[PDB]
Design a protein around this nucleic acid. Structure first.
Lengths: 237, 647, 621
RNA sequence: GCAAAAACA
């Protein structure tokens, strides 16, 4: 296979030019995930203005569908660098994708939008409310999942062949099927990192401290920033 | 100031947020930190005796003192050993579930801790390169040093790392290899002892700049162990400043025929009056009454003994002026106000047995204060975080309240806490107070931020910058620091800054290119009208535009394409989520990046869980690559040809 | 320790990292025992063939993924912590290799996998004999006796017996040398065992004294504080120019004006105007950056450091002494009250242009109405115009900082009124600015339009006359050097609007909470201590002066101001407590005013706030 | 000149 061959010479090349790197333990990966010489800057927002105005702001992978010059304007540096207007160019004369991929990527984000616009708002009541911050689950999930079992649930969805019976037992069976049927257009070698993020956010039941006038359901927690305050409260049906 | 103090329709507590210097430049510390470091080091020695005697305190090993030596009219450094013993025992007898959870953490979670978490720390001093390096680089070089000088492979667990450190401390000679770094037991001991000092930057609310110290990577594993145990104790006690507690005490009500007072205060020289041996005694009492083995006690006591032998770096010299000239001179060369400490100078470092440093043991100090609180006749509600505290007294008599307040001050003095008299205020009928930037007035607790939200894009890319700015504003609203009007105004200011930062305002190259090529502005970073509102902070930018019809389907297919050359943060991947941008360290960096790149493709599971999988990286990669090849449902001959090339 | 002779090397580095042996009680012996078990597995799983593949496959010390594959191909599934050592395709049974002390007392561990038993000198359970073949038994006996002779040679029989009868135990050991190193700077051992009995003593303490009257802050005595800020503030004005771009307005100003000095300061020599006129026409022709002229040398401090160092080296002499810095104490200047009364003056325009956010619900409408009304009430004020001036100037100066240059750059301060006309506040000229660090000071020459001159308030500024179309203006030149951090902070100066708005909302919403009905038009009576008397005023004017104070504090932020505010929060809390008929009690040696007075040295607005605090009653009844 | 317990120029 061509794609399987695409994992061999890279392995041989890595084992050749980096011999001591491979000699390390596999558990060392958790350490050198973030091995970088660059100092952790105190304020990255200061140089954004200069970086955007800098010529060739974007680092892009080598590509052929983006011309070197478009309408008398350079785009790529011919990895190569990209002009600031390259993302604007791709928004009008770029290569499209399947509608299923768009729906899958926007999934767990369109759900929040649909929940916002499918709920009715009561009249705003003004009074001397006392908002006490209580830890509640921030975002609604497709299926309730016990924490510390979320990683085991994600393994079944994405790499069920590289798992253990122990992981299989303590995984939420019932949310794997829902995740598989909505993530399968993006469970490829590309967007593998991304699809995990959407899947994790779909079943993440983390607790956040939010203002509370009445006990919050998961639906009202994600929008608690305007439901209640020191002086106002709006009821949701 | 009278303008900040209303007398009607609003109370001064709510307007006390006006006494804050937001939107102004934070003070920055210039030049040498040597004077500040030396002053911090010398405070505990001047405070040990009621009459200052630095020389007689410079030969004290353990800061144990008699009750008569304690200074009740001024700061007092040191502790009373019997007091610490009894107070720790009392703190153990109370809060049984917290110590049970500590036992559970020791038996179960402690052996499972991995030293890879040490990679997530902040800047460290490298004893090999004699520079400051990020935590991952220092951790990698320290592990390599242990590998070379110890002739065995360090296990992934933190206890294995600590045992490796303890074993390498037993060697007469250690090397690092070309470099060929030559070491010694005394040299390595000094490297372990040395604390790297630096200025505390971007600090507000103080007239004078402070310094913060970092431990070496050799001792950071032990420090993390003890601090993790401290977290597990503190998260399960009602007197800690970690959840709420202030609001709970504010909501507490007392019957009319009672005297309730509220003492709000800080601690003067909190890190300049604490002795690590008191922490040793506290931890030893805790572990001994928990039934832990002797190796647990040894492991917990090592960090504080290494701290007792600290060699805090004394900056880069004191300032000396001849005429208009200026020079930097190390302590000892010429007379100064710190001559008493000249005998303690070891190279560019100075030995210091008494006193702590900021940012070293933030939670063990809180634990020491909390055990100091535990007393028979202190029947109040205490909440303390580091050097800030609030106390609620519920007494039947004003004299009883004053007796309890003085008893509180003295019992904190028993271990060297020393509340600042000028910064401590006791309101008699209670109901008004301050704690950790939270102002309590009449059962309302209002949160006031020390720092205003930046209201600027973070600097990664338009999508994540917009998402993070909206999330920051939403968090500020949730904490109560912002409301409807402030939230919307902050959103408008952030929108203006965000549009300006990405050339979405006025006439720029980006807008000109969009206009010439007839590319309509469809996103906020493209110059379009904002779609986000106050109620829409959590919603994504790409979404809520397709829903509202502002983005038709084919442009979504064009910009959501994963095959685009350019590609909590809940922002969908898009073409606008781009990226903008030591002799033998860059090549090692790129080699590690390539090794990480071959992984995450053959090993999807590391994207969900940790690496685990004991064994060498090369062997694990080879085995997994094989498993993939002969699980590819291809022909057997093709599989044989593919494995023939794996070498 | 080191590799035993009887154990093959490859097994040794295979077992090197299977378990963390170093933190085990007998980790070396446990590792040797595990090596024995794996070697026995290998000799059982020697070269054979069942139906083209070996009947025995080894699961010990193999990657779990391949084990899971092999189990799946055989329709079996074994747990991770009870995975069998090997599996046999003959009877399709999973065998686990065990070493036992005696053969008589041996029961199966579990029914999901069979157990192979050995007694450490070769003999095996009868089940092993029935399962295995004679050659395998002989090989295992040979290996076991070769291991037992090694055990006897090193006298590890007790350790081996303990390893067999039990599981691994955790430990952490500290040697003698590291213990001696630890004991160097402490009076106790590693596990401290003081001989003192646990007891808490009774210590005499002082009394707590009531704060019957509020502390009085100290007004410093000295020369009045001059205006020390990046720009001019309330005295700033602008020139009205015909509609067009910045270049057209700059050309219009340059071509139809003349400059003559009226007040010269030694800090800002009158010759530096030659720099500004050199940057106007250069900007008039479309070049925001120009070359270097002679007058720039004394205007941007070029090569000043080396000259100062040479002068100090050739002049200073004596003996080295400590630096002993000092800060000159200054009194409250009269111009702070003037700045206050002038910053709140009404304006014809709004000066606050912010794109409205979307509206989807009624809460959004309420929030947008509140923000719009606040912008209405604090927009047509001089302080808003000065805020926009500071925003524009700081933004345009900061945008030209990162790019390292050696030539002078001009950054006009030009605003557009809602009629198309241009409003010229001034020009900031940036020097070479070889800024290597975020705290480095870039040189700046700031020309700014004045409303009124005052030598006392502006001692370091040079004031010139400016004639444009029979209109007279004052042009102030100031030589400064300013940091990238501060310029960036003032480029986002608009955030100063947040603090007053809060107060405004906290009033309006409060009125809503009084009647469950928003008004958005309430202008209540806020009662304050003005000119030493309790009197009321309107909410709008109060918010205007709050914004004026916050702007003044923001532009005059320094360690003194932050210390003063942090230590004044306590006194403000005490004053609010004593409004509510609450007593304030204080420690023995406690003087809360000392912390504040330490921060009152020479900050004009700190002194103004101190005077405002002192004008209020110090005792409440 | 900036600034503040000592750095930038």
């Amino acid at each position: 296979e061509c794609t399987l061959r695409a994992l061999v010479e890279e392995y041989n090349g890595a084992c050749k030019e980096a011999p001591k790197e491979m000699s390390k333990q596999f558990t060392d990966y958790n350490t050198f995930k973030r091995y970088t010489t660059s100092k952790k800057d105190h304020a990255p927002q200061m140089r954004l203005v200069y970086s955007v105005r800098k010529p060739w702001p974007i680092s892009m992978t080598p590509s052929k569908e983006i011309p070197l010059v478009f309408n008398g304007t350079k785009l790529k540096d011919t990895r190569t660098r990209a002009n600031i207007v390259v993302p604007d160019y791709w928004s009008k004369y770029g290569s499209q994708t399947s509608l299923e991929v768009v729906n899958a990527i926007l999934y767990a984000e369109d759900l929040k939008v649909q929940r916002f616009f499918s709920t009715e708002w009561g009249e705003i009541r003004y009074g001397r409310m006392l908002p006490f911050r209580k830890p509640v689950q921030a975002c609604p999930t497709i299926e309730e999942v016990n924490p510390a079992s979320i990683p085991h649930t994600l393994l079944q969805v994405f790499c069920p062949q590289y798992t253990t019976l122990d992981s299989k037992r303590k995984a939420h069976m019932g949310a794997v099927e829902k995740l598989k049927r909505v993530m399968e257009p993006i469970c490829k070698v590309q967007t593998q990192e991304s699809a995990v993020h959407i899947a994790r956010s779909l079943i993440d039941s983390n607790k956040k401290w939010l203002p509370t006038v009445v006990d919050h359901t998961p639906r009202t927690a994600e929008m608690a920033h305007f439901l209640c305050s020191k002086y106002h409260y709006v009821h949701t049906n | 100031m009278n303008l900040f103090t209303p007398l009607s329709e609003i109370n001064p507590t709510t307007t006390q947020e006006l006494l804050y210097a937001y939107t102004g430049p934070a003070p920055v510390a210039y030049g040498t930190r040597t004077r500040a470091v030396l002053e911090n080091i010398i405070r505990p020695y001047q405070y040990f005796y009621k009459e200052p005697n630095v020389q007689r305190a410079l030969d004290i090993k353990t800061g144990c003192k008699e009750p008569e030596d304690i200074n009740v009219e001024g700061p007092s450094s040191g502790f009373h050993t019997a007091s610490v013993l009894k107070l720790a025992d009392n703190f153990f007898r109370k809060y049984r579930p917290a110590m049970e959870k500590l036992k559970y953490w020791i038996l179960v979670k402690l052996p499972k801790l991995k030293y890879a978490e040490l990679s997530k720390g902040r800047q460290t001093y490298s004893f090999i390169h004699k520079r400051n390096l990020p935590a991952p680089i220092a951790l990698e070089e320290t592990v390599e040093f242990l590998e070379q000088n110890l002739r065995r492979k360090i296990g992934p667990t933190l206890l294995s790392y600590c045992q490796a450190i303890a074993d390498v401390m037993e060697l007469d000679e250690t090397t690092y290899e070309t470099y060929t770094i030559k070491f010694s037991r005394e040299e390595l001991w000094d490297q372990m002892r040395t604390l790297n000092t630096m200025w505390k930057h971007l600090e507000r609310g103080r007239l004078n700049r402070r310094t913060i110290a970092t431990p070496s990577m050799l001792i950071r594993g032990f420090v993390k162990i003890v601090e993790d145990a401290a977290k597990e104790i503190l998260e399960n006690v009602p007197t800690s400043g970690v959840p709420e507690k202030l609001a709970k005490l504010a909501s507490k009500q007392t019957f009319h025929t009672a005297v309730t007072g509220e003492l709000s205060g800080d601690q003067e020289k909190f890190n300049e009056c604490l002795d690590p041996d008191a922490m040793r005694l506290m931890w030893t009492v805790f572990l001994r009454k928990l039934g832990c083995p002797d190796w647990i006690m040894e492991l917990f006591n090592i960090p504080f003994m290494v701290f007792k032998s600290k060699l805090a770096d004394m900056g880069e010299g004191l300032v000396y002026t001849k005429g208009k000239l200026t020079d930097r001179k190390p302590l000892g060369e010429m007379p100064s106000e710190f001559d008493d400490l000249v005998r303690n100078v070891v190279g560019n470092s100075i030995s210091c047995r008494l006193g702590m440093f900021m940012g070293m043991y933030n939670l063990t100090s809180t634990l020491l204060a909390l055990i100091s609180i535990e007393r028979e006749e202190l029947t109040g509600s205490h909440v303390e975080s580091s050097d800030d505290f609030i106390h609620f007294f519920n007494c039947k008599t004003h004299e009883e309240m004053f007796k309890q307040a003085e008893t509180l001050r003295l019992t904190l003095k028993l271990v060297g806490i020393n509340m600042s008299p000028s910064k401590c205020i006791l309101i008699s009928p209670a109901g008004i107070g301050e704690f950790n930037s939270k102002f309590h007035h009449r059962d309302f607790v209002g949160n006031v931020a020390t720092e205003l939200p930046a209201l600027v894009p973070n600097g990664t890319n338009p999508m994540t910058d917009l998402a993070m700015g909206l999330n920051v504003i939403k968090h500020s609203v949730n904490t109560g620091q912002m409301n409807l009007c402030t939230g919307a105004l902050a959103m408008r200011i952030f929108n203006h800054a965000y549009k300006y930062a990405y050339m979405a305002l006025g006439v720029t190259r980006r807008t000109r290119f969009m206009e010439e090529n007839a590319i309509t502005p469809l996103l906020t970073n493209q110059g379009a009208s904002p779609v986000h509102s106050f109620s829409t902070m959590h919603l994504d930018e790409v979404a809520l535009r397709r829903h509202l019809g502002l983005l038709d389907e084919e442009t979504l297919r064009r910009i959501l394409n994963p095959n685009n050359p350019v590609t909590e943060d809940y922002s969908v991947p898009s073409c606008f989520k781009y990226t903008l941008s030591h002799k033998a360290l860059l090549n090692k960096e790129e080699r590690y990046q390539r090794v990480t790149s071959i992984i995450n493709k053959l090993f999807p599971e590391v994207l969900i869980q940790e690496a685990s999988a004991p064994g060498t990286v090369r062997e694990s990669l080879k085995r997994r690559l094989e498993l993939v090849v002969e699980r590819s449902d291809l022909d057997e001959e093709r599989k044989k040809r593919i494995l023939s090339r794996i070498f | 320790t080191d590799r035993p002779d009887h154990i093959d090397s490859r097994v040794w580095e295979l077992s090197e990292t299977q378990e963390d042996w170093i933190t085990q009680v007998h980790g070396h012996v446990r590792r040797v025992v595990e090596c024995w078990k794996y070697t026995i597995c290998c000799l059982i799983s020697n070269m054979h063939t069942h139906r083209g593949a070996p009947q025995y496959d080894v699961f010990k010390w193999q990657d779990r993924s391949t084990i899971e594959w092999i189990c799946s191909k055989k329709k079996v599934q074994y747990p991770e912590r009870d995975t069998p050592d090997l599996y046999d395709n003959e009877r399709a049974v999973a065998y686990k290799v065990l070493l036992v002390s005696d053969l008589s007392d041996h029961s199966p561990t579990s029914g999901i996998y069979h157990d192979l038993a050995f007694n450490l000198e070769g003999e095996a359970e009868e089940s092993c004999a029935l399962v295995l073949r004679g050659s395998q038994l002989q090989d295992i006996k040979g290996f076991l006796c070769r291991a037992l002779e090694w055990v006897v040679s090193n006298n590890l029989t007790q350790e081996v017996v303990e390893t067999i009868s039990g599981e691994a135990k955790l430990q952490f050991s500290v040697g003698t040398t590291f213990r001696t190193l630890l004991k160097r700077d402490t009076d106790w051992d590693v596990i401290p065992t003081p001989r003192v009995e646990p007891n808490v003593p009774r210590i005499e303490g002082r009394r707590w004294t009531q704060m019957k009257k509020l502390p009085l802050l100290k007004e410093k005595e000295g020369p009045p504080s001059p205006w020390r800020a990046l720009l001019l503030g309330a005295d700033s004005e602008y020139i009205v120019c015909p509609p067009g771009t910045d270049q057209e307005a700059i050309s219009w100003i340059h071509s139809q004006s003349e400059i003559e000095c009226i007040r010269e300061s030694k800090s800002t020599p009158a010759s530096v105007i030659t720099c500004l006129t050199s940057s106007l026409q250069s900007f008039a022709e479309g070049n925001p950056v120009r070359s270097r002229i002679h007058e720039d040398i004394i205007a941007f401090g070029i090569n000043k450091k080396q000259e100062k160092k040479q002068s100090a080296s050739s002049s200073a002499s004596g003996e080295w002494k400590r630096a002993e810095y000092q800060v000159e104490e200054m009194s409250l200047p009269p111009w702070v009250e003037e700045e206050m009364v002038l910053l709140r003056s009404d304006q014809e325009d709004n000066w606050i242009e912010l794109e409205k956010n979307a509206i989807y619900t009624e809460v959004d409408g309420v929030a947008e109405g509140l923000v719009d009304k606040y912008i209405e009430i604090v927009g047509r004020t001089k302080v808003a115009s000065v805020i926009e001036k500071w925003q524009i100037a700081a933004t345009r100066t900061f945008s030209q900082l990162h790019t390292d240059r050696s030539r002078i750059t001009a950054c006009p301060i030009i605003t557009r009124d809602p009629s198309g006309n241009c409003q010229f506040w001034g020009m900031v000229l940036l020097g070479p600015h070889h800024v290597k660090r975020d705290t480095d000071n870039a040189p700046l020459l700031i020309a700014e339009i004045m409303g009124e001159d005052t030598e006392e308030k502006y001692p370091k500024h040079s004031v010139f006359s400016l004639k444009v179309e029979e209109k007279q203006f004052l042009l102030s030149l100031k030589i400064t050097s300013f940091s990238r951090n501060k310029l960036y902070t003032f480029s986002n100066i608009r955030r100063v609007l947040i603090q007053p708005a809060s107060i405004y909302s906290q009033v309006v919403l409060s009125r809503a909470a009084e009647n469950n009905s928003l008004n958005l038009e309430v202008n209540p009576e806020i009662q304050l201590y003005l000119e030493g008397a309790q009197r009321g005023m309107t909410l709008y004017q109060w918010v205007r002066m709050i914004l004026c104070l916050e702007f003044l504090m923001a532009i005059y932020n320094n360690p003194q101001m932050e210390g003063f505010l942090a230590n004044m929060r306590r006194l403000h809390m005490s004053r609010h407590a004593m409004m509510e008929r609450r007593q304030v009690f204080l420690p023995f040696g406690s003087r809360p005013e000392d912390k504040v007075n330490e921060c009152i040295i020479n900050n004009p607005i700190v002194a103004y706030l101190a005077k405002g605090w002192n004008s209020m009653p110090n005792v409440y009844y």
